[PDB]
Amino acid sequence: MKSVITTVVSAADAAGRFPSNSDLESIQGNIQRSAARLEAAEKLAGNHEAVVKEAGDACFAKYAYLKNPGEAGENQEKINKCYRDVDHYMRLVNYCLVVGGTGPLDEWGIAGAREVYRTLNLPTSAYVASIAYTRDRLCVPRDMSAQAGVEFSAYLDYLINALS
Template structure:
């Protein structure tokens, strides 16, 4: 599982060396940013159902999408937000990459899913995040950068 720490250890192991000062500094850097990430993860876990339903109401409220897919869309948005919660905890994009994005294009193409519903939902969540009542400024920027990462991979 790719995270800030495991990435450093993998590359140290690949060259058979003990963690160097620069390895340790990069790990320390990720610890220094960890509080914002963990706050974002905590708040996301609290608000995950609300974020999902608000985004869903917004996207399906526009009537341009088939309403029959709404439940499945809700399930998927919730799923992706959960993976973002994991990414916030690990401090890397490992969980999204391994469990959300790998194979995503193939599944979407095979099932002819409209990715626009997802993209709009995540954009809605990103643009309507209430700071500071949903989460603090730094936590929100960690959360938003992962939303952007996901949106880019869906686009």
């Protein structure tokens, strides 16, 4: 959606012209990253339950005040709801490595977040705790290759920047 192939056929059609030679330089750039971020996509997809096994109770390990009543985490089922709230993000982080752009992360996770979390009383400082814990825990030779872990971590402070 906000991808590389969508932003060249929309720049072709905002000027009303054919596919030129300057958009065919761009799709050659898709060949040079889709051996890196495509096998970064499978590394998150197989290890998806074990990173929220890290980062899920690491979020409450920083702030443990909201395991109280009158708060945002009331009981175990809201904490079971909270692990679904973070697992939707690492779904969408996986989705924009297959796409390439910041397409699925904007209108499925980022747009309306300042609306929803303010009125439903959800703190954004605990949402940026879980992703920044997932950022620095990325070790380069243990997990994947090296450039697969660059645009992995470039999406992780993309949505921190959309919640700071």
